Design a protein around this nucleic acid. Structure first.
Ligand SMILES: [Mg+2]
Ligand SMILES: [Mg+2]
Ligand SMILES: [Mg+2]
Ligand SMILES: [Mg+2]
Ligand SMILES: [Mg+2]
Length: 1336
RNA sequence: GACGCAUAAAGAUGAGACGCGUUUUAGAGCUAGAAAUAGCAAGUUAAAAUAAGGCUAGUCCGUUAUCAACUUGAAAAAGUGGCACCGAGUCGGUGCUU
DNA sequence: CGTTTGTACTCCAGCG
DNA sequence: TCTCATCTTTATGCGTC
DNA sequence: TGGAGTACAAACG
């Protein structure tokens, strides 16, 4: 009577099987409801459930943030317009209306069809005078006469709409820079301040270093060659401070005013000026020259005296584009007359016409045009510019994202300065306009909601609307920044009302250090047995070598302490191997700032120190930190406070203040930390304390501690795993209901965990600092000696990639910059839009322009050819992996391809692990619910957690081979074998059920799980040839109960795996998501187009074209049709797309009448989600994919002998058995060649019965017959592909050796209108069969 | 099986920004021309939208999660489906029982 | 005769 | 693609229930 | 992997 349930849970399916105590799968007759004549169905209690994977909220978050950005951009433009409105009403009162309705066609426009000026001659004259907006912007910057208010508005609105990035902190001032000839002022001011007759007769300026890539090498060599100064600081050590930072941690060179360290012009440099401001401007020109150098690097404009460098560069682009276009046209006409149309008219190619008016990109145009230019003559300059990526550039290209907002701000400020004299209102609210451009909501304030958003946390001081000019006084930024962190941090698990301590808190570090130190044992010659450290010893050890060294080694412990204090000649330490995992890093960091050791050591100020660390952890805005720490300046010096505001900490711990040091034992009065610091002779650590029965901590924690859908909503994590968890729990509940509501004896969950040898684990978890160290050593570079680094810092992704590349770019042969890594970007080699892979094998650090030129592609053939040698050097140094090299060079093997698309992404394993871990405990709490007071929980249902290694070894040892492609039965079979193996193990080794059951309790651990599975085998193999002939009958041992009979139990398993009928059910899902595909299409005379705004007719404006159907509805009604119009009754499926799902559900009859259906029978409207299952003649089943396409729903039941033979013929040389076993299986393969013909006959019969892909089957048969002389291995490997013809799901495509058989989309959902509709429960055991032929 | 610490892999959730891209309109194409066309010239920019839209009207919200049928319930949710054996091509036969 | 569903084939898909 | 933050799953080492 | 759009030709009004 008693039974068990197995589960094989995946991210896209759940397999389930029910087994009795004899390992048989029971079968029952189930009643079937509905109007059909069939009354009951016999069904085996084994099957699988398939469903579409749950989607992560990442793609929704990206859309939501984009929506917010557009909403705020339109508001910026509206603010500028509201400023201009009154003065614009003087000159042109309809100007903003004409701008706003510019999209509409001529007849839809209320005003004149020329937006700016409103008349043809003025509009043409404007577009002739200022061919681009950058001409207008430069003219307004550099022209002192009164400009037109419309032109001023257009320039300002362009800058305010497209305002550049904010990654460069501080006020880069182009108006006080960009004159690279300030080097003269540099040398003069140096001569004034440094008095020992310094060199003044300068040679060539920094222009020589600007021409090539900026580098320490280039700068140093040029300065040595041209300006041999009197001191290295005067010649090199100052000019670097004007351009280049300093990496070494030691002090600077010989002091001119103070010897303290220097660096580039950071946010902390102005506070690093204490080396001169208190000691004296020479360093004032540092900012000037630095900003000149960076702005020259960004913008290739140096000679001109313009005050608009970006606009000047864009105008130079326009001029070069014009001139080179003229030259190219002339050359092509006089040298290649037959290519002129294909280059300059044919927009379907990648010529100039396809570059401008087509869709070709700059790289595609360059690749198309380079052969033509090479074979032509007189194009040397064009080739040079093309190889420099400067030929025929547009003024708005992909790489404008390196323009900081400070450049646009400089141009806007200059314009307002020029025109503020003639338009006084521009003088009045210049500040308002600049704030509109430069305002940006802090990331810690979030959406400025007023209570109606579930993403917002901002707290506002008043109800006044927030604008850039009153944001600072309406938004409570302090509380908002605190809630930003506090809304995401975990609570304490033991005390679920308490926030956790900051990971760097002094209490947390003390708890960690003492909790580790209290369990170490020392032994010596005189000691009889090792004994714990006493309270005095732990106190002395802490104050001696934990508070004076950042990390403590066993060597330090047993040399400095045990041989100097309490002298022991020699000692053995247990409980630490090489180094203490714990440290007082926060203590040392606060000691290097707070010179007062006694302040740290005092107990009374511990609250103040804790609040300081909590502030430095919560807030990272410098003014915010200063405001919070302002109350603590009366304990410290002002220099000390200036240092404190520099101490950034991140990360939060697992335990709270109250748990660690707040709750006290009633009897002793000690806290947990006090017990750790001194607990006499017991020395109980935290785990042993909170579980001690004699201490009140256990009860204090215990007393300090709805639908399943609600609980699932409670748990954190991604929403992807929720679907799988809920579906498998529903499956288990339905199985329990099916078995007379009697709970199963055992539930066996297949866990995705794994045991590894200690060597393998230590290898795979080595420090990334070591990973860099051996590689850099092997390739012999000096990067580590030039840029000292520590393992903690390498957690930064860009820094880690920098060191993995030896400080060079991976797509160009150029150096990177440690001090400017925010410029570069982390490029995905295989693009994000193609494959989800964020592993380091997929990431590369490179300049933003190269990344964005390489849009959604693998690196091009040219890039591969240039950089393959460098990639090979890195691979030899083992900095990059073979996987990374294969990703990088994928363009040499055909680029992106569907065989590369085919695989399991690495995210699926993680989601599977999370789903199984949550499902195990959910099932345990749902099943084992009968508590008791003598023992806490009565374990009614054992939830076994097997590892997949056991079942894989069972399959591979007893030749129950698994081939995924044949059908979906392998999920059900994996569930069945999980149940069998789990119950057999539990019954055979009851003492070790405390290792499998959930809730009971590494090379040795690895060997154990290998040796445990031996009792299934008749003969155990040793390396020397010895065999232990285990008996055919396996008994429990202590009890004598029989568990595994190798005679008949394998027969039962084999019989079950050959069961034809396995309940595969595919979950019917109503589609939700985007209304349609995102591509906006040009206007056409079609009704398939969707209007992208309510007033924009698609026949005139274009629109979207691939609507997503939420569900179909079966409508039986009458439609007017005929050569003379006449209502005819009709039955057909109508697709209710996502856009109008709400419109239909509001009023189905009104919606259908609007569709043109007349006299709809409201009773016969049926909702038909995706994958609704229909059965037709001969068991041909069709799942509904939409209202126009059906999916094949039948499953092929291939015999186990053929499945095993296929797995053996394929994988021919990777069976990984013994040599004799492999040879015998080989002879098996030769002696069963007829299996190929039998399998083809099987597949052909199945196709002719239910697939009905007649032409594809003919192609398959012809290909098989033509290639039947090929080797057996290749025949097997290719015949595995033919199961794409018969797989459940969508018609897809495949290939025999060379013949590619295409797809046969069943685009006819009319055959199903007279079939039987099946409503299948979650397990598929309960059905309701509606015969649609009986509806009329 | 869980927990703390150290190392590491692979992932996740929320916020703030940038750059493109597409769509319609504006930038008078000219010449011989019945001209069906052809020649020639032009080309780089801008405005607007970027899920349709929503109501609590916010510089907010709108693509994640929830869903077999039927009987119930404003809903969430719950409730309903006979057994053994012999077999086996997607489940069948037989015998029991209301 | 004049359509109109029906099949075959091809090709479509916002991104860094 | 940039910036900021928090969190999870698994593997090995040290210590525990 | 569902939609879309052309060409084609059997199939009804
Ligand atoms: Mg599995
Ligand atoms: Mg990229
Ligand atoms: Mg599976
Ligand atoms: Mg969904
Ligand atoms: Mg674990």
């Amino acid at each position: 009577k008693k039974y068990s349930i197995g589960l094989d849970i995946g991210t896209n399916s759940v397999g389930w099987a029910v087994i009795t105590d004899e390992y048989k799968v029971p079968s029952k007759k189930f009643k079937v409801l509905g109007n059909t004549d069939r009354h009951s169905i016999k069904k085996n209690l084994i099957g699988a459930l398939l469903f579409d994977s749950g989607e992560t909220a990442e793609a929704t978050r990206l859309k939501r943030t984009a929506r917010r950005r557009y909403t705020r951009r339109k508001n910026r433009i509206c603010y500028l317009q509201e400023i201009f409105s009154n003065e614009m009403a003087k000159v042109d009162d309809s100007f903003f209306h004409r701008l706003e309705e510019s999209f509409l066609v001529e007849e839809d426009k209320k005003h004149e069809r020329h937006p700016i000026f409103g008349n043809i001659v003025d509009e043409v004259a404007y577009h002739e005078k200022y061919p681009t907006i950058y001409h207008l912007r430069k003219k307004l910057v550099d022209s002192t006469d009164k400009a037109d208010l419309r032109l001023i508005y257009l320039a300002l609105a362009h800058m305010i709409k497209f305002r550049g990035h904010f990654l460069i902190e501080g006020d880069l001032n182009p108006d006080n820079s960009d004159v690279d000839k300030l080097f003269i002022q540099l040398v003069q001011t140096y001569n004034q301040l440094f008095e020992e007759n310094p060199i003044n007769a300068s040679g060539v300026d920094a222009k020589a270093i600007l021409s090539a890539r900026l580098s320490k090498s280039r700068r140093l060599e040029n300065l040595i060659a041209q300006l041999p100064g009197e001191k290295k600081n005067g010649l090199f050590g100052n000019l670097i401070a004007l351009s280049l930072g300093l990496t070494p941690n030691f002090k600077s060179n010989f002091d001119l005013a103070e010897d303290a360290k220097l660096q580039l012009s950071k946010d902390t440099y102005d506070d690093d000026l204490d080396n001169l401001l208190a000691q004296i401007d020479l360093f004032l020109a540092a900012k000037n020259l630095s900003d000149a150098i960076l702005l020259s690097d960004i913008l290739r404009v140096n000679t001109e005296i313009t005050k608009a460098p970006l606009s000047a560069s864009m105008i130079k682009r326009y001029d070069e584009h014009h001139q080179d276009l003229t030259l190219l046209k002339a050359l092509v006409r006089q040298q290649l007359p037959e290519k002129y149309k294909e280059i300059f008219f044919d927009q379907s190619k990648n010529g100039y016409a396809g570059y401008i008016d087509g869709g070709a990109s700059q790289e595609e145009f360059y690749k198309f045009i380079k052969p033509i230019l090479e074979k032509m003559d007189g194009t040397e300059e064009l080739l040079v510019k093309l190889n420099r990526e400067d030929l025929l550039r547009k003024q708005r290209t992909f790489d404008n994202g390196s323009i900081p907002h400070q450049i646009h701000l400089g141009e806007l400020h200059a314009i307002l300065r020029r025109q503020e004299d003639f338009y006084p209102f521009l003088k009045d609210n210049r500040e308002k306009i600049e704030k509109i451009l430069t305002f940006r909501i802090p990331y810690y304030v979030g959406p400025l909601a007023r209570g109606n958003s579930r993403f917002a946390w901002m707290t506002r001081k008043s109800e006044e609307t927030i604008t850039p000019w009153n944001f600072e006084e309406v938004v409570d930024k302090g509380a908002s920044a605190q809630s930003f962190i506090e809304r995401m941090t975990n609570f304490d698990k033991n005390l679920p009302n308490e926030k956790v301590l900051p990971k760097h808190s002094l209490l947390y570090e003390y708890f960690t250090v003492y909790n580790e130190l209290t369990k170490v044992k020392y032994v010596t010659e005189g000691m009889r047995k090792p004994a714990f450290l006493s309270g005095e010893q732990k106190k002395a050890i802490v104050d001696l070598l934990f508070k004076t060294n950042r990390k403590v080694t066993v060597k330090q412990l047993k040399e400095d302490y045990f041989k100097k204090i309490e002298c022991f000649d020699s000692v053995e330490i247990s409980g630490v191997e090489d180094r203490f995992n714990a440290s007082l890093g926060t203590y040392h960091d606060l000691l290097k700032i707070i010179k007062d050791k006694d302040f740290l050591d005092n107990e009374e100020n511990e609250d103040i120190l804790e609040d300081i660390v909590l502030t430095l952890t919560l807030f990272e805005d410098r003014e915010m930190i200063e405001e919070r720490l302002k109350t603590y300046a009366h304990l410290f010096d002002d220099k000390v406070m200036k240092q404190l505001k520099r101490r950034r900490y991140t990360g939060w711990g697992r335990l709270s203040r109250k748990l660690i040091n707040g709750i006290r034992d009633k009897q002793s009065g000690k806290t947990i930390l006090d017990f750790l610091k001194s607990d006499g002779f017991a020395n109980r650590n935290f785990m042993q304390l909170i579980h001690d029965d004699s201490l009140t901590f256990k009860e204090d924690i215990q007393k300090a501690q709805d639908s399943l859908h609600e609980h699932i909503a409670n748990l954190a994590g991604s929403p992807a795993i929720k679907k799988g968890i809920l579906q498998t729990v529903k499956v288990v509940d339905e199985l329990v209901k099916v078995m007379g509501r009697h709970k199963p004896e055992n539930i066996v969950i297949e866990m995705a965990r794994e045991n590894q040898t200690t060597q393998k684990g230590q290898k795979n978890s080595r420090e990334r600092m070591k990973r860099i160290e051996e590689g850099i050593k092997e390739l012999g570079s000096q990067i580590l000696k030039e840029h000292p680094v520590e393992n903690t810092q390498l957690q930064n992704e860009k820094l880690y990639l920098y060191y993995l590349q030896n400080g060079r770019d991976m797509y160009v042969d150029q150096e990177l910059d440690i001090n400017r890594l925010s410029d570069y970007d982390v490029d995905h080699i295989v693009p994000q839009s193609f494959l989800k892979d964020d592993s380091i094998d997929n990431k590369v650090l490179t300049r933003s322009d190269k990344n964005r030129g390489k849009s959604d592609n693998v690196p091009s053939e040219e890039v591969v050819k240039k950089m393959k040698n460098y990639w090979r050097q890195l691979l030899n140094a083992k900095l990059i992996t073979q996987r990374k090299f294969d990703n990088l060079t994928k363009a040499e093997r055909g680029g992106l391809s569907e065989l590369d698309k085919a695989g399991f992404i690495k995210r699926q394993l993680v989601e599977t692990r999370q789903i199984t871990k949550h499902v195990a405990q959910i099932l345990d709490s749902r099943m084992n619910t009968k508590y008791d007071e003598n023992d806490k929980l009565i374990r009614e249902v054992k939830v076994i957690t097997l590892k997949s290694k056991l079942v894989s070894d069972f399959r591979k040892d007893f030749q129950f081979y698994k081939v995924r492609e044949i059908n979906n039965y392998h999920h059900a079979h994996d569930a069945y074998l999980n149940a069998v193996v789990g119950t057999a193990l539990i019954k055979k080794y009851p003492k070790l059920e405390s290792e499998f059951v959930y809730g009971d309790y590494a090379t040795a651990k690895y060997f154990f799980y290998s040796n445990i599975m031996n009792f299934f085998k008749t003969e155990i193999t040793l390396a020397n040839g010895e065999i232990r002939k285990r008996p055919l009958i396996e008994t429990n041992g202590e009890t004598g109960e029989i568990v595994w009979d190798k005679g008949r139990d394998f027969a039962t398993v084999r019989k079950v795996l050959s069961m034809p009928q396995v309940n595969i059910v595919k979950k019917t899902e109503v589609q939700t998501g985007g209304f349609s595909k995102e591509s906006i299409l040009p206007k056409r005379n079609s009704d398939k187009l969707i209007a992208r705004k309510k007033d924009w007719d698609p026949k005139k404006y274009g629109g979207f074209l691939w609507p997503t159907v939420a569900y179909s509805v079966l409508v039986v009604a009458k439609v007017e049709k005929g050569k003379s119009k006449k209502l005819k009754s009709v039955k057909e499926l109508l697709g209710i797309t996502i856009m109008e799902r709400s419109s239909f559900e509001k009023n189905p009859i009104d919606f259908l009448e609007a569709k043109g259906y007349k006299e709809v029978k409201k009773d016969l409207i049926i909702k038909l989600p995706k994958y609704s299952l229909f059965e037709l003649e001969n068991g041909r089943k069709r799942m509904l994919a939409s209202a126009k396409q059906l999916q094949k729903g039948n499953e092929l039941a291939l015999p186990s002998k053929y499945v095993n033979f296929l797995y053996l013929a394929s994988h021919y040389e990777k069976l990984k058995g013994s040599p004799e076993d492999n040879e015998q299986k080989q002879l098996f393969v030769e002696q069963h060649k007829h299996y190929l013909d039998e399998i083809i006959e099987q597949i052909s019969e199945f196709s002719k019965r239910v697939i009905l892909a007649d032409a594809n089957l003919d192609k398959v048969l012809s290909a098989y017959n033509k290639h039947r002389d090929k080797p057996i291995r290749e025949q097997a490997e290719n015949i595995i592909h033919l199961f794409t013809l018969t797989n459940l799901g969508a018609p897809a495509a495949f290939k025999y050796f060379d013949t590619t058989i295409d797809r046969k989309q069943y685009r006819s959902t009319k055959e199903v209108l007279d079939a039987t509709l099946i409503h299948q429960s979650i397990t598929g055991l309960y059905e309701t069969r509606i015969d649609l032929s009986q509806l009329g």
